C-alpha cells in the first residue's frame, strides 16, 4: 500500500516561507490520481491549499494562489509546498494527501500523518519545576511555567516510561502566556532507587530541558 | 458551500444522523470523513453511499438531491470523533468542506475526581515566586468548581483554572494554579485546594517544609 509522509521545519518566521516535502512510499508520483496538501488551523476546520498531478499542472485554492508552490520531484518520489508571505493565519497542521480524481467527482483516498508548523512571532521559554513526589502509589510531576506560543512536548524517562503519565491541557493565564503540569503516577516503592526525568521541550523558544525530579 | 450542523449527540446504541447540505452534491456528490484527535481523517462514506471494506457496517449514507445523510446505527462510545462531508465547487475546480460535526456520545458513568495538589518547588522558591499546582483527573460529568484556602480563609485572587477536557479514557481533566508570593507561602500554616463535583468534595492541603 502506498503510504504518505511529511516533513519539513516545523518553525516559520513571520513573512518568511512554508516549505514542506511529502515523501511518497509504496508506490509512484506518476499515477492517474493527483496530490495535495490541505491544513487545518487547530480547532478548526479542513481547507484545502491545493493539487499537483505527476506532469506538474497545479490548481491552488484561490484564496491561497499568489503564495502557494506546489511541485513534484520524480527522481525522489517526493511532491513538495512552498507557501511565501506567512502570518498567525498559517499556523497549522499541514498534511499531504493523495485525491482520486474523476471526470466530475473528486475525492481523498490516502493522508499523510499531519505535522504542526507554527509561525513564530514573539516567544518566551518556559520555566520548567520539579513536582516532587508511605505505601500505595505517588505522584511526581513537573510543572512547565509560562510559555509561549504553543506547543510543549513532555516525555518521561526518554519515552521510556509511558505508562502512569499524564500531561494536563495547558492553561492559558490571564497573563496571555501558557502553563502545563505532567504527572506520573508510580509505585510508592519505585521511588528510592527508579530515576525520574522530565523531557521538555518547548521548540519555539529552543527550550529543551530534562529536568530531574526527586523527593 | 457546504452546511452541516456544529454539534449532534446520541446516547449509546442509538441513531446518530448528520445531514451535509449544498446545491453541488447532486453532480459532485458527498464523501464522509471521520476524524479522531491527533489523526487525519479517514473516509467513511465514498460517493454518497457506498461504504469502504474496512469501514464498520453501522455506518451508512444516504442522499437526498441537494443534502446527504451519514447515518450511524447503533452508535458506540468509540465513535465520537468530527465528521466532514467534501463536495466540490460548481465549476469543478476546487474541493469544497462542511464546517465539520462533532458527534458526542452521552451516557457515561458518574465518575468521582482524583486530586493531587502540589506546593512550590524549591527552585522556583529561589526565583522568588510561588505556584500551587492542583490537578483533577477521571472526573465525570465534565464540571467542577475549584476553591482555594490559606489555611482556612478563602483565596480568589492568583487563581488560574482550565476548563474540564476530555481525557483519552473520555473521562474529563482540569488543573488550577494558585500564584503566591513566597512570603504568602511562607507565612500561613498551609494551602488547600478543596474540589466540588456534583455536590461532593475532596480536599488536599499542602504545608511549607
Ligand atoms: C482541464 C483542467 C482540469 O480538469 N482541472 C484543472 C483546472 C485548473 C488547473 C489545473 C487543472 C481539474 C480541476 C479540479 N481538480 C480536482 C479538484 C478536486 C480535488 C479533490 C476533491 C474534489 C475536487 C482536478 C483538475
Known amino acids: 500500500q502506498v503510504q504518505l509522509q511529511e516533513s519539513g521545519p516545523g518553525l516559520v518566521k513571520p513573512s518568511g516561507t512554508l516549505s514542506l516535502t511529502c515523501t511518497v512510499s509504496?508506490?509512484?508520483?506518476?499515477?492517474?490520481?493527483?496530490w495535495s496538501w490541505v491544513r487545518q488551523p487547530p480547532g478548526k476546520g479542513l481547507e484545502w491549499i491545493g493539487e499537483?498531478?505527476?506532469?506538474?499542472?497545479?490548481n491552488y485554492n484561490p484564496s491561497l494562489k499568489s503564495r502557494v508552490t506546489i511541485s513534484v520531484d520524480k527522481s525522489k518520489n517526493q511532491f513538495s509546498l512552498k507557501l511565501s508571505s506567512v502570518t498567525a493565519a498559517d499556523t497549522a497542521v499541514y498534511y499531504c494527501?493523495?485525491?482520486?480524481?474523476?471526470?466530475?467527482?473528486?475525492?481523498?483516498?490516502?493522508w499523510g500523518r499531519g505535522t504542526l508548523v507554527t509561525i513564530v512571532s514573539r516567544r518566551l521559554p518556559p520555566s520548567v519545576f520539579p513536582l516532587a513526589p508511605s505505601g500505595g502509589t505517588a505522584a511526581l510531576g513537573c510543572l512547565v511555567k509560562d510559555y509561549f506560543p504553543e506547543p510543549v512536548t513532555v516525555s518521561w524517562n526518554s519515552g521510556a516510561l509511558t505508562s502512569g503519565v499524564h500531561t494536563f491541557p495547558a492553561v492559558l493565564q490571564s497573563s496571555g502566556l501558557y502553563s502545563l503540569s505532567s504527572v506520573v503516577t508510580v509505585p510508592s516503592s519505585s521511588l528510592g532507587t527508579q530515576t525520574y526525568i522530565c523531557n521538555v521541550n518547548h521548540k519555539p523558544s529552543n527550550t529543551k530541558v530534562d529536568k530531574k525530579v526527586e523527593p | 458551500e457546504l452546511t452541516q450542523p456544529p454539534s449532534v449527540s446520541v446516547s449509546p446504541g442509538q441513531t446518530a444522523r448528520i445531514t451535509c447540505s449544498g446545491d453541488t452534491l447532486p453532480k459532485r456528490s458527498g464523501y464522509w470523513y471521520q476524524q479522531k484527535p491527533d489523526q487525519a481523517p479517514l473516509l467513511v462514506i465514498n460517493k454518497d453511499t457506498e461504504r469502504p471494506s474496512g469501514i464498520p457496517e453501522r455506518f451508512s449514507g444516504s442522499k437526498s438531491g441537494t443534502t446527504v445523510t451519514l447515518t450511524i446505527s447503533g452508535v458506540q462510545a468509540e465513535d465520537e470523533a468530527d465528521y466532514y462531508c467534501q463536495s466540490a465547487d460548481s465549476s469543478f475546480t476546487y474541493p469544497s468542506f462542511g464546517g465539520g460535526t462533532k458527534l458526542t456520545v452521552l451516557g457515561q458513568p458518574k465518575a468521582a475526581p482524583s486530586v493531587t495538589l502540589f506546593p512550590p518547588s524549591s527552585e522556583e522558591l529561589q526565583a522568588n515566586k510561588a505556584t500551587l499546582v492542583c490537578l483533577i483527573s477521571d472526573f465525570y460529568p465534565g464540571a467542577v468548581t475549584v476553591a482555594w484556602k490559606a489555611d482556612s480563609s478563602p483565596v480568589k485572587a492568583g487563581v488560574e483554572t482550565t476548563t474540564p477536557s476530555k481525557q483519552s479514557n473520555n473521562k474529563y481533566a482540569a488543573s488550577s494554579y494558585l500564584s503566591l508570593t513566597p512570603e504568602q507561602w511562607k507565612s500561613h500554616r498551609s494551602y488547600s485546594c478543596q474540589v466540588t463535583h456534583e455536590g461532593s468534595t475532596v480536599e488536599k492541603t499542602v504545608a511549607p517544609t
Open positions: 509504496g508506490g509512484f508520483i506518476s499515477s492517474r490520481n493527483w
Open positions: 494527501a493523495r485525491e482520486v480524481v474523476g471526470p466530475t467527482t473528486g475525492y481523498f483516498d490516502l
Open positions: 499537483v498531478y505527476h506532469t506538474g499542472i497545479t
